[PDB]
Design a protein around this ligand. Sequence first.
Ligand SMILES: Cc1cnc(NC(=O)C2CC2)nc1-c1c[nH]c2c(NC(=O)[C@@H](C)N3CCN(C)CC3)cccc12
Length: 286
Amino acid sequence: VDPTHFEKRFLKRIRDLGEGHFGKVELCRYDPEGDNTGEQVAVKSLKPESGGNHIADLKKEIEILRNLYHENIVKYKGICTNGIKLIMEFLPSGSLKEYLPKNKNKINLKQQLKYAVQICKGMDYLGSRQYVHRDLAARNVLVESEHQVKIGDFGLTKAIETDKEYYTVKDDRDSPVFWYAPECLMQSKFYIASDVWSFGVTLHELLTYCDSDSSPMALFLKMIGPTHGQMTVTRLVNTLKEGKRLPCPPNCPDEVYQLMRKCWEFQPSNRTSFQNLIEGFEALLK
Ligand SMILES: Cc1cnc(NC(=O)C2CC2)nc1-c1c[nH]c2c(NC(=O)[C@@H](C)N3CCN(C)CC3)cccc12
């Protein structure tokens, strides 16, 4: 018997956890004994509404996650099998976007920086395997406990080819543009340093406890224009070309803000690394 093979007949849907266009994630219980004692699992599958290219994408995501093993990367459990489903561990506390606003009193600057280190460690692991994540935002970072976070979704993750510095995304459908580096918006080119940019934006979110009024979208839209529709991204590029970045969060030391700023150097080659960030945060923690 294969422990990563989940039979459809025992995989019982409890509720929806998240939904996009063409895909969804559900809370299921895997209950082979039929008495509600089975393990809860997060199940990602494709919607009938979805096109044909979306199945290939889900299969590639599965193969990526199947082979990643890290304390700060969400655990692959298996598959339920043309159509297919990805089975992952379920973390009840959900994402930082959901968890931080409800837990401010429990989570001080020290714990915020400890989470930041954990995000950087999972991301550095991903980078060592030549993947660019392309969706690094607080909503995709899961809370295991008050002491542990995990990178939690790999829907947009792509492999960077050997002897190559970036992946060019042909279809950039529903990209998180307010987390994206200039090269990503301008040329659809994704480097490891592009995830470092995104990490800086995620660090901002963490430091603001994912408050919606000071969210990356909100603050950038105030900077450029709430535009503007079709012109949003090109105006956003122009504001970034001018040198304008998200401001220092309230109660955020300049030292932490300077680490953030190094994520947002206009050129990818001049950005900080995840390892440099870890060392920076670790020196602030001691
Ligand atoms: C694995 C897991 C374990 N545990 C919890 N825990 C909980 O939900 C707690 C709160 C009850 N969640 C997840 C989880 C992993 N991915 C999720 C997504 N993913 C997306 O929507 C993807 C498709 N998009 C994200 C945005 N991106 C721009 C495009 C892709 C939505 C909702 C949940 C999950």
